[PDB]
Swiss-Prot record:
Changing residue 80 to R: In ALS1; sporadic form; interferes with zinc binding. This is Superoxide dismutase [Cu-Zn]. It is found in: Cytoplasm; Nucleus. Cu cation binds at residues 46, 48, 63, 120. The modification N6-succinyllysine is found at residues 3, 9, 91, 122, 136. The keyword Ubl conjugation applies. Its EC number is 1.15.1.1. Its main location: cytoplasm. The lineage of its organism: Eukaryota, Metazoa, Chordata, Craniata, Vertebrata. The protein (both wild-type and ALS1 variants) has a tendency to form fibrillar aggregates in the absence of the intramolecular disulfide bond or of bound zinc ions. These aggregates may have cytotoxic effects. Zinc binding promotes dimerization and stabilizes the native form. GO terms for biological process: action potential initiation; anterograde axonal transport; apoptotic process; auditory receptor cell stereocilium organization; cellular response to ATP; cellular response to cadmium ion; cellular response to potassium ion; determination of adult lifespan. Changing residue 83 to A: Loss of zinc binding and enhanced tendency to form aggregates. A lipid is attached at residue 6 (S-palmitoyl cysteine). Its cofactor is Cu cation; Zn(2+). The gene is SOD1.
Amino acid sequence: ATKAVAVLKGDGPVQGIINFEQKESNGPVKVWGSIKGLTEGLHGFHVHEEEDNTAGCTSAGPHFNPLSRKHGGPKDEERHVGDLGNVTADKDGVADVSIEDSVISLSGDHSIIGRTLVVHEKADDLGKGGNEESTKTGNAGSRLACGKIGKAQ
Ligand SMILES: [Cu+2]
Ligand SMILES: [Zn+2]
């Protein structure tokens, strides 16, 4: 219903618990979470396509894409869909997240369970670098930790 969780983890010590609450069917999805064990400062953060998390987040795909849009974030509109941009981490390597998005829904029609977030090392460039990985991921970093959105209720 309203709630889902994503256990971000990888090989690295970076692990995080994301939480989703949709307080309605068409209302925004309040995302909040804590990632623990990355470097400080801005970390690119977005939704990827994977779902077949059979063994682990090996071949986590590019950013989930509805039709065709480049990469972006909270500057451009030519953002894939799951492009949140980037989030700040404290010096201990703890990134807090607490915001509300209108671009997805875990309740109602599309019920976006399963989806694989990936947390990146460096800040999302907003795909301004002007190379494939800028336009694909915003040159954000080689997929530090990731998981899948599991229904909570
Ligand atoms: Cu990403
Ligand atoms: Zn993107």
